[PDB]
Every structure is written in structure tokens, then in C-alpha cells.
Amino acid sequence: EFMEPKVAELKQKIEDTLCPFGFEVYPFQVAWYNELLPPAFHLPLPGPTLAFLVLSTPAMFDRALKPFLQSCHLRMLTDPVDQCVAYHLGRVRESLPELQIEIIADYEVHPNRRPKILAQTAAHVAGAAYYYQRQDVEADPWGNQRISGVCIHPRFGGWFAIRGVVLLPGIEVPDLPPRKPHDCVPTRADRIALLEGFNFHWRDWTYRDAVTPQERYSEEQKAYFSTPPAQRLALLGLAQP
Ligand code: CNC
């Protein structure tokens, strides 16, 4: 009846399940996501439907991936981190058994090769990380190249990843208050440098420092993500109990 207490209760339940393992949780309305998108990407839910954007902080690697590797057998052709994230998104269901919930991870792609969710658009409208796009630089320098956008977290910079959306059909919060993402890379020259670093130099990691981060990925975590996905899956499978 009154949704404000309901949103807080649901958020707290999801945070209790996910925050100990290195995730953060942000509510948004489905309408805010659909509003920005062409119909191919629309979530076919009523606009006031409550959703949650899930991202991983640097701590996810130690708090979730490492214990996961000790307890679960790795499947082929799926990155270990994606298997870990699928496991933890699955725990959200166990934590709300009396609700119909729908979960779409960042790694999910349609047979037509479109991603099932636009993770960066969800992160922006959930107020979690400003999504910096080519059109945020007027008269940008890149011409007729594809230039991908990039989200920057106000606490972690680019040292984070977007992991999924949790949708709660039937739970409608038309008055959920919009929380705008922090424009933490405001200047033109910094926006150009960020987009250049992400698009053409992302293997040197430096785009993630576009704001000073409270924490970075550990050198061990950086070793993992620096390793080609085929090799890291082969090596972790080799060493598993
Ligand atoms: C496919 C994909 C994806 N990738 Co890559 C990965 N892995 N990626 C790739 C590949 C191609 C990317 C591409 N084609 O653009 C490749 C090339 C495989 C790749 C590579 C990388 N990726 C990388 C990363 C980190 C990420 N990738 C994701 C973007 C990550 C995605 C995860 C996900 N599920 O979203 C991902 C699965 C889908 C991205 C996509 O297709 N978007 C392109 C297009 C469809 O979206 P768009 O450009 O934003 O356009 C929409 C918006 O503009 C929106 N819109 C319109 N008006 C507005 C107004 C506003 C205000 C807003 C907010 C939106 C809009 O509408 C448009 C659609 O019509 C990421 C969000 C995944 C994650 N966090 O788990 C993450 C970025 C995180 C961040 N800080 O933003 C890499 C560094 C490698 C890595 N470590 O994984 C590297 C970076 C180079 C690069 N060029 O991106």
C-alpha cells in the first residue's frame, strides 16, 4: 500500500544477501531505463516497476570469487567471474522466495548478439555511476570510429563492474525518487582523456583512475583480468580441488 517502506525492506534484503560479498545495490524505476532507449531494448514491464542495479566493488574478487573457486566446479566456455556472479544473483531469489523476480546479468546476450540489458544505462538511471558517452564531448576528436561509453563510480572510479539488474514484477513504485548520478568527471579535457583511455588504452588500466579511487583492484585481481579468458578458465580449472 505504502511503497516507501517496501522499497527499503526489499533493498535491505538484497543488500544483506549481496553486500557481504562485495556488491552494491541501487533501486530504479523501469520507466527511467526504457525512457532513454529504442524499443528493441525495452523491458516489457510496467514503467513504475521496481528494479535494482547490482555492481561489484574491488572487494568482490576476494570476498566472492576466491571462496567460490573452493566450492563450485567450473563449467566450460563461461568466465569464472560470470559463474560466480550467476551464483550470487541466484542467492537473491533464495532471499525473496515469495516474490516473482527476474534477473538479467551483464554477460547475457541474445541470439541476435544484442546484450539483454544495457548495464551502463541502468547504472546511470539508478544513480550508481555516471555513464560518459561520446555525445558528452561536443565536436569530439574521433570522427567515424565507434567510440564506446564508460561509467565512472564516484568512490571507485572505474575500479568496479556492473553485474546485473533484479526486476520485481508486480512491485510498482511510481513515486520512487530519482537520484541523479554524480557528474564526477565534469570537464571536457577529462572526458576526452577518459574516453580515449577506455577505447584505445584500456589494457593499461589508467582510465579507471579518472577519479581518485578509495580502493583499486588488487594486483592479484589485475593479474586475473589481464589474463585472456580462455587461459584463466583453463588455469583455474586445472588447480581446482
Ligand atoms: C559487448 C561488450 C560489452 N561490454 Co565491454 C565487456 N566485457 N565489451 C563489449 C565488447 C564491445 C563493446 C561495444 N560493442 O560497444 C568488447 C569490445 C567485447 C568489450 C570490451 C570491453 N568491455 C570492457 C568493460 C570493462 C565493460 N564492458 C561493458 C560495457 C560491456 C557490456 C555489458 C552490458 N550488458 O551492457 C557489453 C556486454 C555490452 C555493451 C554494448 O553492446 N553496448 C553498446 C550499445 C548497445 O550501447 P550504448 O553504446 O550504450 O548505446 C545506448 C545508449 O547510448 C542508450 N542511450 C541513448 N540515449 C541515452 C541517454 C542517456 C542519459 C543514457 C544513460 C543512455 C542513453 O541507448 C543506446 C542504444 O540505443 C561493461 C559495462 C561490463 C561490466 N561492467 O560488467 C564494462 C564497462 C564498465 C564501465 N565502467 O562502464 C573492457 C575494458 C574489457 C573488460 N575488462 O571487460 C573493454 C573496453 C573496450 C570497449 N570498446 O568497450
mmCIF file of C-alpha atoms and ligand atoms in Angstrom:
data_model
loop_
_atom_site.group_PDB
_atom_site.id
_atom_site.type_symbol
_atom_site.label_atom_id
_atom_site.label_comp_id
_atom_site.label_asym_id
_atom_site.label_seq_id
_atom_site.Cartn_x
_atom_site.Cartn_y
_atom_site.Cartn_z
ATOM 1 C CA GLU A 1 0.000 0.000 0.000
ATOM 2 C CA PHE A 2 2.712 2.436 1.061
ATOM 3 C CA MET A 3 5.687 1.568 -1.105
ATOM 4 C CA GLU A 4 8.380 3.638 0.614
ATOM 5 C CA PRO A 5 8.760 1.122 3.489
ATOM 6 C CA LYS A 6 8.502 -1.734 0.988
ATOM 7 C CA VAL A 7 11.364 -0.406 -1.138
ATOM 8 C CA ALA A 8 13.537 -0.063 1.960
ATOM 9 C CA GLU A 9 12.720 -3.583 3.144
ATOM 10 C CA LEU A 10 13.444 -5.116 -0.264
ATOM 11 C CA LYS A 11 16.657 -3.143 -0.663
ATOM 12 C CA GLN A 12 17.825 -4.267 2.776
ATOM 13 C CA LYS A 13 17.086 -7.918 1.995
ATOM 14 C CA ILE A 14 19.068 -7.744 -1.250
ATOM 15 C CA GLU A 15 21.925 -5.860 0.471
ATOM 16 C CA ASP A 16 22.070 -8.468 3.262
ATOM 17 C CA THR A 17 22.449 -11.159 0.593
ATOM 18 C CA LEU A 18 24.927 -9.320 -1.645
ATOM 19 C CA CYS A 19 26.875 -6.595 0.196
ATOM 20 C CA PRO A 20 28.943 -9.064 2.336
ATOM 21 C CA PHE A 21 30.280 -10.476 -0.946
ATOM 22 C CA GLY A 22 31.395 -7.167 -2.431
ATOM 23 C CA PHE A 23 28.303 -5.923 -4.272
ATOM 24 C CA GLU A 24 26.357 -2.641 -4.103
ATOM 25 C CA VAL A 25 22.629 -2.269 -4.790
ATOM 26 C CA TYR A 26 20.712 0.730 -6.273
ATOM 27 C CA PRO A 27 16.953 0.991 -6.968
ATOM 28 C CA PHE A 28 15.464 2.480 -10.106
ATOM 29 C CA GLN A 29 12.152 2.542 -11.979
ATOM 30 C CA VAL A 30 11.863 0.558 -15.198
ATOM 31 C CA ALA A 31 10.443 3.691 -16.884
ATOM 32 C CA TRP A 32 13.697 5.598 -16.315
ATOM 33 C CA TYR A 33 15.601 2.899 -18.230
ATOM 34 C CA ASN A 34 13.039 2.426 -21.042
ATOM 35 C CA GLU A 35 12.617 6.211 -21.437
ATOM 36 C CA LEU A 36 16.112 6.508 -22.885
ATOM 37 C CA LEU A 37 16.067 3.524 -25.200
ATOM 38 C CA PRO A 38 14.723 2.361 -28.547
ATOM 39 C CA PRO A 39 12.006 -0.305 -28.325
ATOM 40 C CA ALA A 40 14.393 -3.201 -29.052
ATOM 41 C CA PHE A 41 15.872 -2.692 -25.589
ATOM 42 C CA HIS A 42 12.670 -2.036 -23.623
ATOM 43 C CA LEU A 43 11.993 -4.172 -20.597
ATOM 44 C CA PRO A 44 8.370 -5.302 -21.128
ATOM 45 C CA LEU A 45 7.245 -4.355 -17.637
ATOM 46 C CA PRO A 46 5.049 -1.521 -16.375
ATOM 47 C CA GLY A 47 7.059 1.683 -16.089
ATOM 48 C CA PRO A 48 6.725 2.080 -12.300
ATOM 49 C CA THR A 49 8.114 -1.439 -11.779
ATOM 50 C CA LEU A 50 10.810 -1.541 -9.124
ATOM 51 C CA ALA A 51 14.261 -2.697 -10.199
ATOM 52 C CA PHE A 52 17.697 -2.937 -8.611
ATOM 53 C CA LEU A 53 21.060 -2.346 -10.292
ATOM 54 C CA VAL A 54 23.839 -4.578 -8.896
ATOM 55 C CA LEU A 55 27.531 -3.723 -9.268
ATOM 56 C CA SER A 56 30.716 -5.269 -7.865
ATOM 57 C CA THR A 57 33.358 -3.294 -5.960
ATOM 58 C CA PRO A 58 37.071 -4.309 -5.817
ATOM 59 C CA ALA A 59 36.220 -6.424 -2.776
ATOM 60 C CA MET A 60 34.075 -8.851 -4.791
ATOM 61 C CA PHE A 61 37.156 -10.676 -6.066
ATOM 62 C CA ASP A 62 38.388 -11.561 -2.552
ATOM 63 C CA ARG A 63 35.007 -11.867 -0.857
ATOM 64 C CA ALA A 64 33.159 -13.820 -3.555
ATOM 65 C CA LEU A 65 35.308 -15.219 -6.378
ATOM 66 C CA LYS A 66 38.005 -16.798 -4.187
ATOM 67 C CA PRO A 67 35.581 -18.763 -1.907
ATOM 68 C CA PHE A 68 33.532 -19.660 -4.988
ATOM 69 C CA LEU A 69 36.537 -21.342 -6.601
ATOM 70 C CA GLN A 70 36.935 -23.500 -3.472
ATOM 71 C CA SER A 71 33.337 -24.758 -3.500
ATOM 72 C CA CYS A 72 31.958 -24.900 -7.061
ATOM 73 C CA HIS A 73 33.035 -26.784 -10.185
ATOM 74 C CA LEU A 74 33.740 -24.545 -13.170
ATOM 75 C CA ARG A 75 31.677 -25.080 -16.355
ATOM 76 C CA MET A 76 33.260 -24.616 -19.755
ATOM 77 C CA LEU A 77 33.011 -21.561 -22.005
ATOM 78 C CA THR A 78 31.852 -19.311 -19.141
ATOM 79 C CA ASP A 79 34.248 -16.971 -17.348
ATOM 80 C CA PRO A 80 34.782 -17.892 -13.660
ATOM 81 C CA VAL A 81 33.643 -14.435 -12.526
ATOM 82 C CA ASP A 82 30.426 -14.775 -14.530
ATOM 83 C CA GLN A 83 29.799 -18.150 -12.912
ATOM 84 C CA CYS A 84 30.454 -16.551 -9.521
ATOM 85 C CA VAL A 85 28.078 -13.666 -10.271
ATOM 86 C CA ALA A 86 25.382 -16.065 -11.539
ATOM 87 C CA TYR A 87 25.666 -17.962 -8.251
ATOM 88 C CA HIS A 88 25.238 -14.824 -6.170
ATOM 89 C CA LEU A 89 22.413 -13.383 -8.267
ATOM 90 C CA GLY A 90 20.771 -16.773 -7.736
ATOM 91 C CA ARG A 91 21.003 -16.253 -3.968
ATOM 92 C CA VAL A 92 18.826 -13.136 -4.339
ATOM 93 C CA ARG A 93 15.954 -15.496 -5.263
ATOM 94 C CA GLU A 94 16.528 -17.636 -2.166
ATOM 95 C CA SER A 95 16.380 -14.429 -0.176
ATOM 96 C CA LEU A 96 12.930 -13.428 -1.562
ATOM 97 C CA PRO A 97 11.183 -16.777 -2.213
ATOM 98 C CA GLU A 98 7.623 -15.367 -2.104
ATOM 99 C CA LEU A 99 8.271 -12.900 -4.954
ATOM 100 C CA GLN A 100 8.420 -13.390 -8.675
ATOM 101 C CA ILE A 101 11.790 -11.906 -9.533
ATOM 102 C CA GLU A 102 13.581 -11.654 -12.866
ATOM 103 C CA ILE A 103 17.357 -11.309 -13.026
ATOM 104 C CA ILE A 104 19.415 -10.274 -16.046
ATOM 105 C CA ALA A 105 23.185 -10.358 -15.757
ATOM 106 C CA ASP A 106 25.656 -8.089 -17.586
ATOM 107 C CA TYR A 107 27.081 -11.021 -19.548
ATOM 108 C CA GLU A 108 23.748 -12.118 -21.022
ATOM 109 C CA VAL A 109 23.386 -11.708 -24.791
ATOM 110 C CA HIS A 110 20.532 -12.532 -27.190
ATOM 111 C CA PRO A 111 20.985 -15.000 -30.076
ATOM 112 C CA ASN A 112 20.905 -11.893 -32.307
ATOM 113 C CA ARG A 113 24.016 -10.699 -30.389
ATOM 114 C CA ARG A 114 22.352 -7.704 -28.644
ATOM 115 C CA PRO A 115 23.032 -7.590 -24.867
ATOM 116 C CA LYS A 116 19.922 -8.402 -22.878
ATOM 117 C CA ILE A 117 20.418 -5.345 -20.638
ATOM 118 C CA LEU A 118 22.381 -2.163 -21.236
ATOM 119 C CA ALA A 119 24.263 -2.273 -17.964
ATOM 120 C CA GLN A 120 25.688 1.250 -18.217
ATOM 121 C CA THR A 121 22.279 2.837 -18.879
ATOM 122 C CA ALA A 122 20.867 1.052 -15.824
ATOM 123 C CA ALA A 123 23.829 2.203 -13.742
ATOM 124 C CA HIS A 124 23.248 5.795 -14.833
ATOM 125 C CA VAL A 125 19.498 5.928 -14.121
ATOM 126 C CA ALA A 126 19.990 4.129 -10.801
ATOM 127 C CA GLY A 127 22.319 6.937 -9.767
ATOM 128 C CA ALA A 128 25.194 4.489 -9.310
ATOM 129 C CA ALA A 129 27.724 5.688 -11.896
ATOM 130 C CA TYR A 130 27.531 8.483 -14.456
ATOM 131 C CA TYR A 131 27.607 6.973 -17.969
ATOM 132 C CA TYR A 132 30.029 9.091 -20.028
ATOM 133 C CA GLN A 133 29.281 8.835 -23.737
ATOM 134 C CA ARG A 134 30.717 10.231 -26.921
ATOM 135 C CA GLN A 135 27.966 12.835 -27.089
ATOM 136 C CA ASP A 136 29.135 14.205 -23.705
ATOM 137 C CA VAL A 137 32.047 15.781 -25.623
ATOM 138 C CA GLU A 138 30.862 18.218 -28.246
ATOM 139 C CA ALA A 139 32.811 18.162 -31.512
ATOM 140 C CA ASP A 140 34.725 15.164 -30.223
ATOM 141 C CA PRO A 141 38.011 14.219 -31.945
ATOM 142 C CA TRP A 142 37.192 10.670 -33.073
ATOM 143 C CA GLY A 143 35.255 11.048 -36.332
ATOM 144 C CA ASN A 144 33.794 7.947 -37.949
ATOM 145 C CA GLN A 145 35.010 5.445 -35.365
ATOM 146 C CA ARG A 146 32.836 3.588 -32.926
ATOM 147 C CA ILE A 147 33.528 5.150 -29.518
ATOM 148 C CA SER A 148 32.177 3.210 -26.563
ATOM 149 C CA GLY A 149 30.946 4.973 -23.441
ATOM 150 C CA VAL A 150 32.114 4.312 -19.882
ATOM 151 C CA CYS A 151 30.626 4.650 -16.381
ATOM 152 C CA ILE A 152 32.630 6.192 -13.529
ATOM 153 C CA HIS A 153 31.768 5.334 -9.904
ATOM 154 C CA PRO A 154 32.233 8.300 -7.528
ATOM 155 C CA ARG A 155 34.004 6.140 -4.923
ATOM 156 C CA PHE A 156 35.826 3.534 -7.031
ATOM 157 C CA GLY A 157 36.337 5.356 -10.329
ATOM 158 C CA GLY A 158 36.489 2.647 -12.974
ATOM 159 C CA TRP A 159 37.608 0.020 -10.430
ATOM 160 C CA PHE A 160 34.174 -1.647 -10.379
ATOM 161 C CA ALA A 161 31.931 -3.602 -12.744
ATOM 162 C CA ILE A 162 28.189 -3.681 -13.398
ATOM 163 C CA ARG A 163 26.813 -7.145 -12.773
ATOM 164 C CA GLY A 164 23.051 -7.194 -13.266
ATOM 165 C CA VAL A 165 19.516 -5.965 -12.799
ATOM 166 C CA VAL A 166 16.941 -7.504 -10.477
ATOM 167 C CA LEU A 167 13.389 -6.867 -11.665
ATOM 168 C CA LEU A 168 10.376 -7.212 -9.348
ATOM 169 C CA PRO A 169 7.239 -7.509 -11.487
ATOM 170 C CA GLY A 170 4.119 -6.543 -9.571
ATOM 171 C CA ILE A 171 6.004 -4.190 -7.233
ATOM 172 C CA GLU A 172 5.282 -0.697 -8.592
ATOM 173 C CA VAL A 173 6.729 2.481 -7.096
ATOM 174 C CA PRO A 174 5.596 5.407 -9.277
ATOM 175 C CA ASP A 175 6.903 7.916 -6.723
ATOM 176 C CA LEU A 176 10.384 6.392 -6.316
ATOM 177 C CA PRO A 177 12.608 9.470 -6.120
ATOM 178 C CA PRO A 178 15.131 9.930 -8.943
ATOM 179 C CA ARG A 179 18.721 10.084 -7.717
ATOM 180 C CA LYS A 180 20.899 11.565 -10.423
ATOM 181 C CA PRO A 181 24.385 10.057 -10.839
ATOM 182 C CA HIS A 182 27.299 12.210 -9.745
ATOM 183 C CA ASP A 183 28.938 14.045 -12.654
ATOM 184 C CA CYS A 184 32.361 13.269 -11.228
ATOM 185 C CA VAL A 185 34.300 13.704 -14.490
ATOM 186 C CA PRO A 186 32.869 17.118 -15.389
ATOM 187 C CA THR A 187 35.435 18.791 -17.617
ATOM 188 C CA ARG A 188 35.882 18.443 -21.364
ATOM 189 C CA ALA A 189 39.572 17.549 -21.317
ATOM 190 C CA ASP A 190 38.971 14.886 -18.659
ATOM 191 C CA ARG A 191 36.025 13.433 -20.567
ATOM 192 C CA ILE A 192 38.167 13.161 -23.720
ATOM 193 C CA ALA A 193 41.014 11.524 -21.772
ATOM 194 C CA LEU A 194 38.606 9.091 -20.107
ATOM 195 C CA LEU A 195 37.001 8.010 -23.386
ATOM 196 C CA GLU A 196 40.399 7.773 -25.114
ATOM 197 C CA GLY A 197 41.770 5.646 -22.266
ATOM 198 C CA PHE A 198 38.758 3.339 -22.249
ATOM 199 C CA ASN A 199 38.557 2.890 -26.012
ATOM 200 C CA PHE A 200 42.219 2.764 -27.020
ATOM 201 C CA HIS A 201 44.305 2.082 -23.900
ATOM 202 C CA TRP A 202 42.130 0.092 -21.512
ATOM 203 C CA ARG A 203 44.764 -2.590 -21.005
ATOM 204 C CA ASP A 204 46.956 -0.119 -19.108
ATOM 205 C CA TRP A 205 44.108 0.337 -16.539
ATOM 206 C CA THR A 206 44.637 4.102 -16.338
ATOM 207 C CA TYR A 207 41.083 5.124 -17.397
ATOM 208 C CA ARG A 208 39.839 3.672 -14.088
ATOM 209 C CA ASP A 209 41.710 6.408 -12.204
ATOM 210 C CA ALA A 210 39.543 9.155 -13.762
ATOM 211 C CA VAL A 211 38.625 9.958 -10.166
ATOM 212 C CA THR A 212 40.838 9.066 -7.250
ATOM 213 C CA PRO A 213 39.570 5.640 -6.116
ATOM 214 C CA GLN A 214 39.042 4.654 -2.495
ATOM 215 C CA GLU A 215 40.370 1.214 -3.475
ATOM 216 C CA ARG A 216 41.715 -0.404 -6.634
ATOM 217 C CA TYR A 217 41.669 -3.992 -7.777
ATOM 218 C CA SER A 218 44.467 -5.894 -6.100
ATOM 219 C CA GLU A 219 47.493 -6.894 -8.167
ATOM 220 C CA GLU A 220 46.173 -10.449 -7.937
ATOM 221 C CA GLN A 221 42.782 -9.373 -9.305
ATOM 222 C CA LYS A 222 44.562 -7.371 -12.032
ATOM 223 C CA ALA A 223 46.581 -10.475 -12.932
ATOM 224 C CA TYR A 224 43.329 -12.373 -13.378
ATOM 225 C CA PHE A 225 41.626 -9.832 -15.641
ATOM 226 C CA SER A 226 44.844 -9.265 -17.595
ATOM 227 C CA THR A 227 44.866 -12.956 -18.492
ATOM 228 C CA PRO A 228 42.948 -13.966 -21.647
ATOM 229 C CA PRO A 229 39.617 -15.551 -20.695
ATOM 230 C CA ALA A 230 40.422 -18.927 -22.286
ATOM 231 C CA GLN A 231 43.678 -19.212 -20.345
ATOM 232 C CA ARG A 232 42.327 -18.092 -16.992
ATOM 233 C CA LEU A 233 39.496 -20.604 -17.210
ATOM 234 C CA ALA A 234 41.984 -23.334 -18.142
ATOM 235 C CA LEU A 235 44.335 -22.434 -15.293
ATOM 236 C CA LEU A 236 41.654 -22.165 -12.614
ATOM 237 C CA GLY A 237 40.090 -25.448 -13.725
ATOM 238 C CA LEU A 238 43.495 -27.099 -13.584
ATOM 239 C CA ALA A 239 44.034 -26.059 -9.940
ATOM 240 C CA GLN A 240 40.534 -26.734 -8.549
ATOM 241 C CA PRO A 241 40.002 -29.281 -5.721
HETATM 242 C C1 CNC B 1 29.672 -6.123 -25.911
HETATM 243 C C2 CNC B 1 30.542 -5.588 -24.788
HETATM 244 C C3 CNC B 1 30.048 -5.276 -23.565
HETATM 245 N N1 CNC B 1 30.839 -4.788 -22.593
HETATM 246 CO CO1 CNC B 1 32.656 -4.466 -22.522
HETATM 247 C C4 CNC B 1 32.893 -6.086 -21.850
HETATM 248 N N2 CNC B 1 33.051 -7.156 -21.437
HETATM 249 N N3 CNC B 1 32.875 -5.076 -24.256
HETATM 250 C C5 CNC B 1 31.972 -5.410 -25.080
HETATM 251 C C6 CNC B 1 32.575 -5.569 -26.472
HETATM 252 C C7 CNC B 1 32.138 -4.436 -27.444
HETATM 253 C C8 CNC B 1 31.562 -3.165 -26.819
HETATM 254 C C9 CNC B 1 30.618 -2.439 -27.770
HETATM 255 N N4 CNC B 1 30.229 -3.091 -28.870
HETATM 256 O O1 CNC B 1 30.233 -1.301 -27.518
HETATM 257 C C10 CNC B 1 34.106 -5.799 -26.277
HETATM 258 C C11 CNC B 1 34.521 -4.959 -27.495
HETATM 259 C C12 CNC B 1 33.755 -7.267 -26.377
HETATM 260 C C13 CNC B 1 34.035 -5.150 -24.912
HETATM 261 C C14 CNC B 1 35.188 -4.705 -24.448
HETATM 262 C C15 CNC B 1 35.343 -4.088 -23.151
HETATM 263 N N5 CNC B 1 34.449 -4.074 -22.233
HETATM 264 C C16 CNC B 1 35.085 -3.713 -21.072
HETATM 265 C C17 CNC B 1 34.418 -3.371 -19.944
HETATM 266 C C18 CNC B 1 35.094 -3.030 -18.642
HETATM 267 C C19 CNC B 1 32.959 -3.305 -19.937
HETATM 268 N N6 CNC B 1 32.229 -3.683 -20.903
HETATM 269 C C20 CNC B 1 30.831 -3.435 -20.666
HETATM 270 C C21 CNC B 1 30.416 -2.121 -21.354
HETATM 271 C C22 CNC B 1 30.122 -4.390 -21.585
HETATM 272 C C23 CNC B 1 28.639 -4.622 -21.753
HETATM 273 C C24 CNC B 1 27.784 -5.166 -20.598
HETATM 274 C C25 CNC B 1 26.301 -4.867 -20.831
HETATM 275 N N7 CNC B 1 25.448 -5.868 -20.633
HETATM 276 O O2 CNC B 1 25.888 -3.754 -21.167
HETATM 277 C C26 CNC B 1 28.593 -5.410 -23.072
HETATM 278 C C27 CNC B 1 28.304 -6.893 -22.795
HETATM 279 C C28 CNC B 1 27.502 -4.781 -23.972
HETATM 280 C C29 CNC B 1 27.865 -3.359 -24.443
HETATM 281 C C30 CNC B 1 27.058 -2.933 -25.655
HETATM 282 O O3 CNC B 1 26.732 -3.746 -26.515
HETATM 283 N N8 CNC B 1 26.721 -1.648 -25.715
HETATM 284 C C31 CNC B 1 26.752 -0.886 -26.954
HETATM 285 C C32 CNC B 1 25.407 -0.223 -27.193
HETATM 286 C C33 CNC B 1 24.334 -1.290 -27.350
HETATM 287 O O4 CNC B 1 25.053 0.562 -26.051
HETATM 288 P P1 CNC B 1 25.369 2.128 -25.983
HETATM 289 O O5 CNC B 1 26.565 2.444 -26.843
HETATM 290 O O6 CNC B 1 25.445 2.491 -24.508
HETATM 291 O O7 CNC B 1 24.108 2.848 -26.656
HETATM 292 C C34 CNC B 1 22.913 3.023 -25.910
HETATM 293 C C35 CNC B 1 22.921 4.257 -25.026
HETATM 294 O O8 CNC B 1 23.553 5.345 -25.732
HETATM 295 C C36 CNC B 1 21.425 4.492 -24.818
HETATM 296 N N9 CNC B 1 21.108 5.930 -24.633
HETATM 297 C C37 CNC B 1 20.600 6.749 -25.573
HETATM 298 N N10 CNC B 1 20.435 7.996 -25.070
HETATM 299 C C38 CNC B 1 20.825 7.986 -23.773
HETATM 300 C C39 CNC B 1 20.890 8.952 -22.780
HETATM 301 C C40 CNC B 1 21.353 8.628 -21.503
HETATM 302 C C41 CNC B 1 21.392 9.696 -20.440
HETATM 303 C C42 CNC B 1 21.800 7.234 -21.205
HETATM 304 C C43 CNC B 1 22.309 6.879 -19.829
HETATM 305 C C44 CNC B 1 21.724 6.271 -22.209
HETATM 306 C C45 CNC B 1 21.266 6.612 -23.486
HETATM 307 O O9 CNC B 1 20.776 3.961 -25.991
HETATM 308 C C46 CNC B 1 21.754 3.325 -26.829
HETATM 309 C C47 CNC B 1 21.156 2.101 -27.503
HETATM 310 O O10 CNC B 1 20.190 2.622 -28.427
HETATM 311 C C48 CNC B 1 30.724 -3.361 -19.134
HETATM 312 C C49 CNC B 1 29.558 -2.418 -18.726
HETATM 313 C C50 CNC B 1 30.633 -4.750 -18.469
HETATM 314 C C51 CNC B 1 30.584 -4.819 -16.941
HETATM 315 N N11 CNC B 1 30.725 -3.726 -16.210
HETATM 316 O O11 CNC B 1 30.461 -5.919 -16.395
HETATM 317 C C52 CNC B 1 32.118 -2.806 -18.773
HETATM 318 C C53 CNC B 1 32.234 -1.269 -18.603
HETATM 319 C C54 CNC B 1 32.098 -0.836 -17.132
HETATM 320 C C55 CNC B 1 32.057 0.682 -17.017
HETATM 321 N N12 CNC B 1 32.901 1.262 -16.161
HETATM 322 O O12 CNC B 1 31.272 1.337 -17.673
HETATM 323 C C56 CNC B 1 36.613 -3.744 -21.324
HETATM 324 C C57 CNC B 1 37.578 -2.829 -20.550
HETATM 325 C C58 CNC B 1 37.097 -5.180 -21.192
HETATM 326 C C59 CNC B 1 36.725 -5.788 -19.876
HETATM 327 N N13 CNC B 1 37.587 -5.565 -18.885
HETATM 328 O O13 CNC B 1 35.693 -6.441 -19.762
HETATM 329 C C60 CNC B 1 36.653 -3.448 -22.817
HETATM 330 C C61 CNC B 1 36.619 -1.949 -23.157
HETATM 331 C C62 CNC B 1 36.752 -1.631 -24.656
HETATM 332 C C63 CNC B 1 35.414 -1.252 -25.291
HETATM 333 N N14 CNC B 1 35.443 -0.854 -26.566
HETATM 334 O O14 CNC B 1 34.354 -1.306 -24.670
#
